[PDB]
Amino acid sequence: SSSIKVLKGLDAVRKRPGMYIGDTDDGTGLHHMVFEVVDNAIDEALAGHCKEIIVTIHADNSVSVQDDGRGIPTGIHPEEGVSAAEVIMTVLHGLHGVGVSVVNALSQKLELVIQREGKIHRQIYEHGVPQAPLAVTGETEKTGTMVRFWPSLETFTNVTEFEYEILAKRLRELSFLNSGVSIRLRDKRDGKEDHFHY
Ligand SMILES: CNc1cc(F)cc2cc(C(=O)Nc3ccc(C(=O)O)cc3)c(=O)[nH]c12
Questions:
Q1: Distance, CA of 126 to CA of 131 (rounded, Å)
Q2: Is the CB of 73 under 6 A from ligand 1?
Q3: Which spans in the chain are helix H?
Q4: Long-range residue pairs from 71-75, CB within 8 A, at least 24 positions apart, any chain
Q5: Is the CB of 41 under 6 A from ligand 1?
Q6: Which atom of ligand 1 lies nearest, measured to the CA of 89?
Q7: Cβ atoms within 10 A of the Cβ of 84, count?
Q8: How far apart are CA 100 and CA 81, in angstroms?
Q9: Ligand 1 centroid, distance to 158 Cα (angstroms)
Q10: I need a surface site. Which of 15, 19, 38, 58 has the fewest CB within 10 A?
Q11: Ligand 1 atom at minimal distance to the Cα of residue 44
Q12: Pairing mode of beta strands 107-116, 144-151
């Protein structure tokens, strides 16, 4: 029932993305993809477990968000028989707080790395669909969640390149609204970076 329902959700967002992420031509939906993911990292900081969030603009016009929180739980849900991470990355829930599955749905590719309980876990998605169940790839002393997404050029036209200043404005805004949380923005394309703390 869950697999069928998840795919209905991804299909729903694919066909009517204006209802979930916003305008797909003018760049406002493309940048909102970043802010949805960052918002999830801010929830983990507001729970008191994350101190630093790193937002990177990569050269291939993908964006990663890294937190040093406790990592998305990896335990296979007894209920629907897949990692809790995959439930969070794929299940749907106005045009704010839309859930990370929307970003996943409208991403050509999405990379999940979780560090938790001594192990690194990795998963790949294409258009919201897991390539393989979450899997252990190594060990670590660290904790946190890293999400990197390549926006679908099926979904996004005209403004397809992330603009530093637009991410910079909102991240500085988010650090003002959530005192304590530290945010790094880094552009791999030209080396630019900022640090937002209030
Ligand atoms: C870049 N970071 C990031 C991106 C994203 F798209 C989703 C998330 C989701 C969580 C979360 O559910 N954290 C969480 C939930 C439950 C527990 C627990 O029960 O121990 C811990 C952490 C997170 O901590 N970080 C995220």
A1: 7
A2: yes
A3: 2-15, 28-46, 84-90, 100-105, 164-177
A4: 71/114, 71/115, 71/116, 71/121, 71/143, 71/144, 71/145, 72/112, 72/114, 72/116, 72/145, 73/116, 74/114, 74/116, 74/117, 74/119, 74/121, 74/134
A5: yes
A6: 6
A7: 16
A8: 20
A9: 32
A10: 15
A11: 24
A12: antiparallel
CB under 8 A, 24+ apart: contacts of 11-15: 12/92, 13/92, 13/101, 13/102, 13/105, 13/106, 13/128, 14/105, 14/106, 14/127, 14/155
Which residue shows structure tokens 């291939």?
60
> In terms of C-beta density within 10 A (0-12 exposed, 13-18 middle, 19 or more buried), how is residue 44 classed?
buried
Structure tokens at 45: 């900081």
Resolution to one decimal, Å: 2.3
Does ligand 1 come within 6 angstroms of the Cβ of 34?
A: no
Give the 3-state secondary structure of 115-163.
Answer: EECCEEEEEEEECCEECCCCEEEEECCCCEEEEEEEECCCCCCCCCCCC
Residue of 111, 125, 103, 87 lying closest to 21 (CA atoms): 103
How many other C-beta atoms are found inside a 10 Å radius of the C-beta of residue 22?
A: 18
> Looking up tokens 């993911």, which residue turns up?
37
- The torsion region of residue 191 among left (phi > 0), alpha (psi -120 to 50) and beta comes to left
Method underlying the structure = X-ray
